[PDB]
């Protein structure tokens, strides 16, 4: 059985991942840091009753800065796939502490990649690399593509792009297999609660059961090609199974704007949004049944946004034979949903 070794496996992309290739019979390890309280809810019911199920899945205590402690783990584990998905993933933190974010999701790609090399590894471990389509940032092509030039528009997309650049380096420094997935935005029930759209769906349920008056939100007019987690890390894995190394974008090839998102979560509990002020300002907010329900902070909004993201997934539907299977429709309506569930359970 083949061993993978999943970074950032208590997230988003790295639970549904460990699900996957646990169905598939992997022996999984996942490394987590270390929290003050519980911080394993994505993965706990994967080893709630590891001593009956005897399932292939182990969790490690490490972190993306300690480069000894990645060469120690690895060193021990020889795994055949390396998913690096760890980072402070999130835009708006990127500018409060772009130092860090950088060390994580910069250097943390390096440490990895170095880590093959010093136990030799080369031949045995592929590696896949969470790259993004914030890399193209103020898009020079639209749709964007694998051969869309890169304009970051954020610390985290500029440490993202060092990660993309080093692994592409590795891989024609040292014949390694690695690559990079440049996956666009995706979601799920799982979504950290401050992006956007987590916090719409959680925001619109609170709403529905009478625990929040109002939702407050920045950019409305953002656009973003939006898929479902779980339809992405199989492409994750798709790629690792390709003869060669190279890289893929995986997206749906259509693009929404939050404030459609908006729309369409109300819409799920049989509301209807009217917006009212100046369109685009400050001064916008969402109106349901008379009542004010979305406003714009300032707050949200980034120093240098990202307006618009669409992506061409041509290259891994007709090489990986992958597309996505959720709808947009569809992922609205299963977050609002999952987020009334969560609240009634
Ligand atoms: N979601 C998207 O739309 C999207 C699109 C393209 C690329 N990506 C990238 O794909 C990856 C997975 O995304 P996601 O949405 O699943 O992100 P996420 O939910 O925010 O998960 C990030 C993971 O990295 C871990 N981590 C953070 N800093 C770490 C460190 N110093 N050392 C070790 N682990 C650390 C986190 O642990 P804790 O639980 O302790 O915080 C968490 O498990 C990320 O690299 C992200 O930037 C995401
Ligand atoms: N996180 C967040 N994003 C918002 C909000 N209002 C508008 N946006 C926009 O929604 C888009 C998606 O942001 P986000 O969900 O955080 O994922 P991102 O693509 O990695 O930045 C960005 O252009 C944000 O500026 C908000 O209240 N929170
Ligand atoms: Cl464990």
Redesign the pocket.
């Known amino acids: 059985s083949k061993v993978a070794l999943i970074?950032?496996?208590?997230?988003?992309?790295?639970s549904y991942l460990a699900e996957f290739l646990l169905e598939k019979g992997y022996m999984v390890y996942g490394?987590?840091?270390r929290?003050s309280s519980f911080?394993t809810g994505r993965v706990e019911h994967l080893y709630k009753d590891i001593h009956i199920t005897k399932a292939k899945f182990k969790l490690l205590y490490?972190?993306?800065?300690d480069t000894g402690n990645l060469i120690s783990i690895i060193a021990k584990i020889k795994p055949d796939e390396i998913y690096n998905?760890?980072?402070?993933?999130?835009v708006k933190v990127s500018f409060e502490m772009p130092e860090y974010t950088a060390n994580?999701?910069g250097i943390?790609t390096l440490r990895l990649l170095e880590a093959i090399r010093a136990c030799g590894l080369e031949k045995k471990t592929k590696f896949y690399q969470?790259?993004?389509?914030?890399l193209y940032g103020l898009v020079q092509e639209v749709p964007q593509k694998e051969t869309t030039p890169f304009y970051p528009r954020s610390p985290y997309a500029c440490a993202?792009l060092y990660s993309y650049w080093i692994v592409v380096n590795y891989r024609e420094a040292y014949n390694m297999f690695a690559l990079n997935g440049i996956?666009?935005?995706?979601?799920s029930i799982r979504?950290?609660p401050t992006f956007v759209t987590r916090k719409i769906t959680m925001a619109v349920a609170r709403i529905k059961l009478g625990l929040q008056d109002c939702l407050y939100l920045g950019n409305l007019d953002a656009e973003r090609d939006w898929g479902h987690?779980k339809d992405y890390v199989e492409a994750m894995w798709l790629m690792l199974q390709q003869e060669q190394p190279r890289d893929f974008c995986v997206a749906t090839g259509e693009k929404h704007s939050v404030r459609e998102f908006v729309e369409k979560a109300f819409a799920c509990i049989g509301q209807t949004v009217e917006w009212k002020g100046e369109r685009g300002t400050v001064e916008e907010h969402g109106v349901v049944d008379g009542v004010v329900r979305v406003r714009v902070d300032p707050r949200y909004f980034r120093p240098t946004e990202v307006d618009q993201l669409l992506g061409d997934p041509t290259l891994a539907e007709t090489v990986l034979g992958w597309k996505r299977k959720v709808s947009f429709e569809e992922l609205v309506r299963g977050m609002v949903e999952g987020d009334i569930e969560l609240l009634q359970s």
Do not use: M, W
């Open positions: 970074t950032g496996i208590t997230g988003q992309d790295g490394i987590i840091r929290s911080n490490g972190d993306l800065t998905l760890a980072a402070q993933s999130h994580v999701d943390g969470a790259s993004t389509s914030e993202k996956l666009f935005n995706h979601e979504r950290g987690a």
